Amino acid sequence: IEKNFVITDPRLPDNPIIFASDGFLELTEYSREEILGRNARFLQGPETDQATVQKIRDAIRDQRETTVQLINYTKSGKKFWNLLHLQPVRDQKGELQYFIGVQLDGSDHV
Numbered sequence: 001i002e003k004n005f006v007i008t009d010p011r012l013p014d015n016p017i018i019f020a021s022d023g024f025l026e027l028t029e030y031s032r033e034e035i036l037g038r039n040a041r042f043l044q045g046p047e048t049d050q051a052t053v054q055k056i057r058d059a060i061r062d063q064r065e066t067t068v069q070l071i072n073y074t075k076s077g078k079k080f081w082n083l084l085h086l087q088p089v090r091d092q093k094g095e096l097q098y099f100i101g102v103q104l105d106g107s108d109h110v
């Protein structure tokens with residue numbers, strides 16, 4: 001059902017994006033080559049609430065699922081409310097392997 005998402009590898013320095021879906025590319029206006037290997041915080045900007053960023057950081061540290069809403073920015077500077085859902089992905093041994101993040105732009109752009 002989920003069309004905008006990325007997968008990150010927390011076993012690599014700074015938990016970089018290793019896969020971005022076409023929907024994510026379309027939402028954010030970036031090309032794959034522009035975002036593969038980067039941490040997803042490039043979506044954040046001036047009006048992104050630091051309290052919420054902290055909550056994300058905590059859930060990642062604790063390796064648990066969370067959902068937050070925060071201001072993000074497309075490549076051209078456009079703001080949207082991202083309802084962001086994060087899910088840890090463990091391997092067959094129960095060791096953290098990836099995180100999946102699903103982005104939903106809850107902003108009516110009519």
Ligand SMILES: Cc1cc2nc3c(=O)[nH]c(=O)nc-3n(C[C@H](O)[C@H](O)[C@H](O)COP(=O)(O)O)c2cc1C
Nearest residue numbers: 006008039040041043044053056057099100101103
């Ligand atoms: C899988 C995944 C997807 C993420 N997607 C977003 C996102 O869409 N927008 C956003 O602002 N942060 C996103 N983040 C959060 C940032 O990557 C980072 O974890 C957050 O800013 C907290 O860490 P920091 O204080 O080092 O910046 C995502 C994190 C993960 C693991």
